[PDB]
From Swiss-Prot, chain A:
Component of the ATP synthase complex composed at least of ATP5F1A/subunit alpha, ATP5F1B/subunit beta, ATP5MC1/subunit c (homooctomer), MT-ATP6/subunit a, MT-ATP8/subunit 8, ATP5ME/subunit e, ATP5MF/subunit f, ATP5MG/subunit g, ATP5MK/subunit k, ATP5MJ/subunit j, ATP5F1C/subunit gamma, ATP5F1D/subunit delta, ATP5F1E/subunit epsilon, ATP5PF/subunit F6, ATP5PB/subunit b, ATP5PD/subunit d, ATP5PO/subunit OSCP. GO terms for cellular component: mitochondrial inner membrane; mitochondrion; nuclear membrane; proton-transporting ATP synthase complex. The keyword Membrane applies. Keywords: Acetylation, ATP synthesis, CF(0), Hydrogen ion transport, Ion transport, Membrane, Mitochondrion, Mitochondrion inner membrane, Phosphoprotein, Transmembrane, Transmembrane helix, Transport. It comes from Homo sapiens. The modification N6-acetyllysine is found at K3. The gene is ATP5MF. It is a single-pass membrane protein. Its main location: mitochondrion. GO terms for biological process: proton motive force-driven ATP synthesis; proton motive force-driven mitochondrial ATP synthesis; proton transmembrane transport. This is ATP synthase F(0) complex subunit f, mitochondrial. The chain crosses the membrane at residues 49-66.
UniProtKB/Swiss-Prot annotation, chain B:
It is found in: Mitochondrion; Mitochondrion inner membrane. The modification N6-acetyllysine is found at K20, K31, K36, K43. Component of the ATP synthase complex composed at least of ATP5F1A/subunit alpha, ATP5F1B/subunit beta, ATP5MC1/subunit c (homooctomer), MT-ATP6/subunit a, MT-ATP8/subunit 8, ATP5ME/subunit e, ATP5MF/subunit f, ATP5MG/subunit g, ATP5MK/subunit k, ATP5MJ/subunit j, ATP5F1C/subunit gamma, ATP5F1D/subunit delta, ATP5F1E/subunit epsilon, ATP5PF/subunit F6, ATP5PB/subunit b, ATP5PD/subunit d, ATP5PO/subunit OSCP. One of its GO terms (molecular function) is proton-transporting ATP synthase activity, rotational mechanism. Ubiquitous. The keyword Transport applies. This is ATP synthase F(1) complex subunit epsilon, mitochondrial.
From Swiss-Prot, chain F:
This is ATP synthase peripheral stalk subunit b, mitochondrial. The modification N6-succinyllysine is found at K87. It comes from the Eukaryota. It is found in: Mitochondrion; Mitochondrion inner membrane. The modification N6-acetyllysine is found at K95. Belongs to the eukaryotic ATPase B chain family. Subunit b, of the mitochondrial membrane ATP synthase complex (F(1)F(0) ATP synthase or Complex V) that produces ATP from ADP in the presence of a proton gradient across the membrane which is generated by electron transport complexes of the respiratory chain. ATP synthase complex consist of a soluble F(1) head domain - the catalytic core - and a membrane F(1) domain - the membrane proton channel. These two domains are linked by a central stalk rotating inside the F(1) region and a stationary peripheral stalk. Component of the ATP synthase complex composed at least of ATP5F1A/subunit alpha, ATP5F1B/subunit beta, ATP5MC1/subunit c (homooctomer), MT-ATP6/subunit a, MT-ATP8/subunit 8, ATP5ME/subunit e, ATP5MF/subunit f, ATP5MG/subunit g, ATP5MK/subunit k, ATP5MJ/subunit j, ATP5F1C/subunit gamma, ATP5F1D/subunit delta, ATP5F1E/subunit epsilon, ATP5PF/subunit F6, ATP5PB/subunit b, ATP5PD/subunit d, ATP5PO/subunit OSCP. The gene is ATP5PB.
UniProtKB/Swiss-Prot annotation, chain I:
Component of the ATP synthase complex composed at least of ATP5F1A/subunit alpha, ATP5F1B/subunit beta, ATP5MC1/subunit c (homooctomer), MT-ATP6/subunit a, MT-ATP8/subunit 8, ATP5ME/subunit e, ATP5MF/subunit f, ATP5MG/subunit g, ATP5MK/subunit k, ATP5MJ/subunit j, ATP5F1C/subunit gamma, ATP5F1D/subunit delta, ATP5F1E/subunit epsilon, ATP5PF/subunit F6, ATP5PB/subunit b, ATP5PD/subunit d, ATP5PO/subunit OSCP. One of its GO terms (cellular component) is fibrillar center. This is ATP synthase F(0) complex subunit j, mitochondrial. Signal peptide: none annotated. Subunit j, of the mitochondrial membrane ATP synthase complex (F(1)F(0) ATP synthase or Complex V) that produces ATP from ADP in the presence of a proton gradient across the membrane which is generated by electron transport complexes of the respiratory chain. ATP synthase complex consist of a soluble F(1) head domain - the catalytic core - and a membrane F(1) domain - the membrane proton channel. These two domains are linked by a central stalk rotating inside the F(1) region and a stationary peripheral stalk. The keyword Mitochondrion applies. The chain holds residues 2 to 42 of 58 of the full protein. It comes from the Eukaryota. Belongs to the small mitochondrial proteolipid family. Its main location: mitochondrion. It is found in: Mitochondrion membrane.
Length: 74, 45, 75, 77, 44, 105, 132, 223, 41, 75, 75, 75, 75, 75, 75, 75
């Protein structure tokens, strides 16, 4: 996996198919869920990190409207 | 005017049933002595 | 025209007088619930009083819709 | 409270004039890795790591900017 | 936790870039100051 | 499969401890923090994070979420644990009641 | 100022006692009584009865039926037909008898007898609710 | 300008609103397990509580919708709650979506009340002890009332969640303009903003329970 | 066409065929309503 | 004319004062239901009080329809 | 004239303040029915309180008809 | 135009008549709570009276939204 | 003048705020009847509370007649 | 423009219809307090009726904010 | 001027919002009479609740006198 | 300007919608007094219901101050 491979061919070795990216998201989901949520005596931070990643995704598309309230002019 | 009054009961009766059901829900350590002290033996003639 | 225009404000204002019957009708059929919960054997005699109150209340409400239409069309 | 300065006295210090040859030493190492192009041995894990410290020192430059302008929210003019 | 001395390169980089920022910040401050004053006056 | 007993060891409910220990070797302990204060300062200076009304609605909803967490965290914590043990207790009990029944058989 | 009197056909829980407050399950909805309370007279339904002594301690009983009478001289007379302390009852027999009466209600068809079923139903429901 | 937070968000030209509406379900994990983590423990408990508070009044025919209604209150409550996040786009502030939630469910309910029950359904158009001279006026009343039930459903949600968000945004703007002026007043307005955020949290949950309880009561009226 | 109608169409068939019948009739009434709305606009 | 126009707004506004009697009448015949459910033996004496309250309430309501017509026609 | 016209709207608006006494009078003679059904032996003392409440209520109602006529004629 | 302008004020004013049903509906479902707390065995018969009161109350409320839209669009 | 004209509408509108005290005073002296019918021995202590409520209620009512005259004459 | 101006008065007026829900909601959650103080064992069933009343009350309140925004922006 | 004129109508209208506190204060000190007639031993604890209700009620009333003076003088 | 002028009347009118919360808040903290005088042992649970009612009531009141400031400044 990445963090270990150092070949620019790795990017083409992957399966860039609908079922490929689907299983890629499903794996990342179960990897997140199993590490932060699917644990007894778990914590709330397993959720807050999703909200912060959600806020950041929200502030992203909302930039095209928030760049007209700029205080400075440069 | 409660429902059993429309039915034709009386607070003597409402009180008997209520005091009865409260006697049954007693634990058996107390159920016997409390049924004795509150039983009825009179008979109309 | 200033007359055709003022007829809209005048007919609109007089309709606010219906708000009095919206509240008066809620009190009648609210007191019928309370009054019937206390003496349910009088259900038929209580309801007779609710309709009388409902009618007399809405009566004042339609007097407003009267003027609301007396101004909008009859003038 | 005070433990910040306890650590700051280790890592948050202007570098002594005696360790600058070690700084250019690692500076010549990284330019050597660029000359040969051997940076391809560098697996992405540390590759991101150096990229992160690269963004850090970049941030120190921008921190130097905002204090050079006597203003925080952009240029006050 | 025992601290860790940062490598000299990074520490040299952080402070060198820091001073260049103070140089650049003061440099662009006095560059934008005139034209800002002129466009402020020219707007009205 | 049984569930692990602890989660991901996150700092400030936003950043997992993997990030700090991953950055600990090169720039020590304060490294991740001085990266953060660097990143936020550059963002709010180059007008990446424009200050607006949404800022103060943010500082409020972040104010309640932090308070709501810091107040009713423990209550929801053990309540969830209590619901588990009670289900565990009732179940293992109905494991004994089987044993005793057929043992009498 | 209030002189309470809580009794049963065979037990006197209080007699002219000076309490501060008393909660009762009247047939016309519960209410708590303090000193100088407006004079009233009511008959009870199954439910708790809480008594607050002046020292801030609370005794809890369970009355089945009876009568309450708050008077002009701040003298209360609470006479329950069957007064038991809470710890003399059990939850199982309560829930069990509640089901049997609920079973007999859907089964019954005569008006009067059905009322007696309902009376025993509400008798139990207040039992389980007052117990725990 | 002011209603920027209600415009359909687009990221890189793509309709990012399709992601935000698909997201809230991602916070309800499920498990075949019999004893599981804290999140699913509490959630499994709430879903049981809600289903008991909503579906109890229903007969055997009504409780068939128990999946839909509990899934409806869990989606609306999660969307409203997520919407309170900064810069979020709250898809319940949209009249489009709320219409698309209220029109089917209200229509699905009255239809199943008109297929069967059609003689009781038309009889529900007149209360029982209604007098004779008042019969004809009281039928045109209800048919208009029944017709505005779905409109009331969607508007009660969009107008309550929109007004709540806009209000928090205005008072928030006041604190900003007050930042460079008297500081205690900034603290007072901020305190107002804090108490308002708490109200918006209580309204977010109530509006979900209200939308659902009203769909439920429509269901009970036709089952 | 595997694991889709296996995980999506079987569990919802009890709902998509007899429970939600009146819902779809309503959803069409909705599409007709939004269509007549977006037509005169 | 600005006078003929203002007469419509003025007569329309004064009609809103009837909303007070729509609500006041609902309270009277609402309290009659509650008061009669308590002591139904006083039915004849209670009703005597309702009509007195109904009259005095609607009295203030017609004072508004007074001005509403005093402005619309008498001026 | 804009003054003669505005006098009609101003006098019409101030009359809406009578709606407060239409409702306040309904509450007084509504509570008299409830209060008398409970303790009919106090009939004479209760009625004494109703008139006091009726007067004080309608007092605020005539203060509006005051301004309504202070504007329409006295100005 | 003075007509298109007056239609906004007239339709805006007639909407205030909905405030009467906002209050009347609160009284009905407020008295249902009180009436049901006293005789909970009549729950099904009380609720039957609440819906009747709710309908008749909101009826006067929609008559205002009637005129509010009769003026804004139908004229 | 448009100022002398607007003073009539502004002073007329602010008088509607007296309708709040017409209703609030009816509730106070309505609850005094109910409260006294229940515990007539507290007559002197109840009445003490009615006057306090009557004063505080009419206080908000005169604040409106304040502005009504602050606009009509003081401006 | 006279249209852009009248939209402010029309949208401002229609907002007054929210005052009906401010009062209707106070009655519901006021009767819930009274109704729960008498039969506290029905707490869960009473609250179920309060939310139903709160929703139906505020429903008429948002119909006003509907028109208030239908006029201010949609026209 | 049309601005100096509209300030009188705007400040006059916002004063009508005080009518809400005239009625809300009457209910508080009306319920204090009823609530104290029932349990006079709680006199000190009841009165504590009346002042809290009186303050919160009049709070909404002064927010109107706020805008009434914010428009008349501060603008 | 006719726009700057109409903004004062529109913002002044929308403030009258606060009168609904002045009355609704008086009913909540009025029923809390009555409800607590009857079952003082529920003091903590009753007060929990008063704050919920106070919040939901004043909620409709601030929606009016919303529009009152949305018109005065944001437009």
């Amino acid at each position: 996996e990445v963090k270990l491979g150092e070949l620019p061919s790795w990017i083409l070795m992957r399966d860039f198919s609908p079922s490929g990216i689907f299983g890629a998201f499903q794996r990342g989901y179960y990897r997140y869920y199993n590490k932060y949520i699917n644990v007894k005596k778990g914590s709330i931070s397993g959720i807050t990190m999703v909200l912060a990643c959600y806020v950041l995704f929200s502030y992203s598309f909302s930039y095209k409207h928030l760049k007209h309230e700029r205080l400075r002019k440069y | 005017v409660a429902y059993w009054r429309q039915a034709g009961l009386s607070y003597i009766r409402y009180s008997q049933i209520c005091a009865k059901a409260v006697r049954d829900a007693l634990k058996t350590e107390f159920k016997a002595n409390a049924e004795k002290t509150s039983g009825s033996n009179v008979k109309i003639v | 025209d200033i007359d055709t225009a003022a007829k809209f404000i005048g007919a609109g204002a007089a309709t606010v007088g219906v708000a009095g019957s919206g509240a008066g009708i809620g009190t009648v059929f609210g007191s019928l619930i309370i009054g019937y919960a206390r003496n349910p054997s009088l259900k038929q005699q209580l309801f007779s009083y609710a309709i009388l109150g409902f009618a007399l209340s809405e009566a004042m409400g339609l007097f407003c819709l009267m003027v609301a239409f007396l101004i909008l069309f009859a003038m | 409270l005070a433990t910040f300065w306890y650590y700051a006295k280790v890592e948050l210090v202007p570098p002594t004039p005696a360790e600058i040859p070690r700084a250019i030493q690692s500076l010549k190492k990284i330019v050597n890795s660029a000359q040969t192009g051997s940076f391809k041995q560098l697996t992405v894990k540390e590759a991101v790591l150096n990229g992160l410290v690269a963004t850090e020192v970049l941030m120190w430059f921008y921190v130097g900017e905002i204090i050079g302008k006597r203003g925080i929210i952009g240029y006050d003019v | 936790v025992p601290p860790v001395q940062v490598s000299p390169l990074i520490k040299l980089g952080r402070y060198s870039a820091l001073f260049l920022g103070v140089a650049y910040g003061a440099t662009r401050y006095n560059y934008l100051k005139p034209r800002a004053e002129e466009e402020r006056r020219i707007a009205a | 499969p049984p569930l692990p007993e602890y989660g991901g060891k996150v700092r400030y409910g936003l950043i997992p401890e993997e990030f700090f220990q991953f950055l600990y070797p090169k720039t020590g302990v304060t490294g991740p923090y001085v990266l953060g204060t660097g990143l936020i300062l550059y963002a709010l200076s180059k007008e990446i994070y424009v200050i607006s009304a949404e800022t103060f609605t943010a500082l409020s909803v972040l104010g309640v979420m932090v308070y709501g967490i810091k107040k009713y965290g423990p209550f929801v914590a053990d309540f969830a644990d209590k619901l588990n043990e009670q289900k565990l207790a009732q179940l293992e009990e109905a494991k004994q009641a089987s044993i005793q029944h057929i043992q009498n058989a | 100022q209030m002189s309470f009197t809580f009794a049963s056909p065979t037990q006197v829980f209080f007699n002219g006692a000076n309490v501060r407050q008393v909660d009762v399950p009247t047939l016309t909805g519960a209410f708590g009584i303090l000193a100088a309370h407006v004079p009233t007279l009511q008959v009870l339904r199954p439910g708790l009865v809480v008594v607050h002594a002046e020292d801030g301690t609370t005794s809890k009983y369970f009355v089945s039926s009876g009568s309450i009478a708050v008077n002009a001289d701040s003298s209360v007379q609470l006479l329950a037909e069957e007064a038991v302390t809470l710890d003399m009852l059990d939850l199982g027999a309560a829930k069990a008898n509640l089901e049997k009466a609920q079973a007999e209600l859907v089964g019954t068809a005569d008006e009067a007898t059905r009322a007696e079923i309902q009376i025993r139903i509400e008798a139990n429901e207040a039992l389980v609710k007052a117990l725990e | 300008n002011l209603f920027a937070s209600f415009i359909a968000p687009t990221i890189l030209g793509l309709p990012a609103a399709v992601l935000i509406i698909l997201f809230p379900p991602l916070l309800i994990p499920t498990s075949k397990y019999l004893i599981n983590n804290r999140l699913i423990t509490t959630q499994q408990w709430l879903i049981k509580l809600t289903s008991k508070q909503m579906m109890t009044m229903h007969n055997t025919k009504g409780r068939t919708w128990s999946l839909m209604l509990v899934s409806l209150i869990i989606f609306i409550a999660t969307t409203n709650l997520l919407g309170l996040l900064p810069h979020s786009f709250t898809p319940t502030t949209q009249l489009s979506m709320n219409l698309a939630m209220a029109i089917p469910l209200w229509a699905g309910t009255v239809i199943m009340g008109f297929r069967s029950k059609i003689k009781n359904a038309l009889a529900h158009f007149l209360p029982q002890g209604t007098p004779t001279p008042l019969i004809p006026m009281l039928v045109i009343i209800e048919t208009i009332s029944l017709l505005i039930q779905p409109m009331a459903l969607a508007v009660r949600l969009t107008a309550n969640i929109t007004a709540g968000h806009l209000l928090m945004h205005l008072i928030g703007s006041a604190t900003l303009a007050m930042s460079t002026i008297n500081l205690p007043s900034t603290l007072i307005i901020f305190t107002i903003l804090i108490l308002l955020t708490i109200l918006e949290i209580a309204v977010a949950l109530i509006q979900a329970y209200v939308f659902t309880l009203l769909v439920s009561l429509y269901l009970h009226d036709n089952t | 066409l595997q694991s889709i109608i296996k995980n999506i169409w079987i569990p919802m068939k009890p709902y998509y065929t007899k429970v939600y019948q009146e819902i779809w009739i309503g959803m069409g009434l909705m599409g007709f309503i939004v269509y007549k709305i977006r037509a005169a606009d």
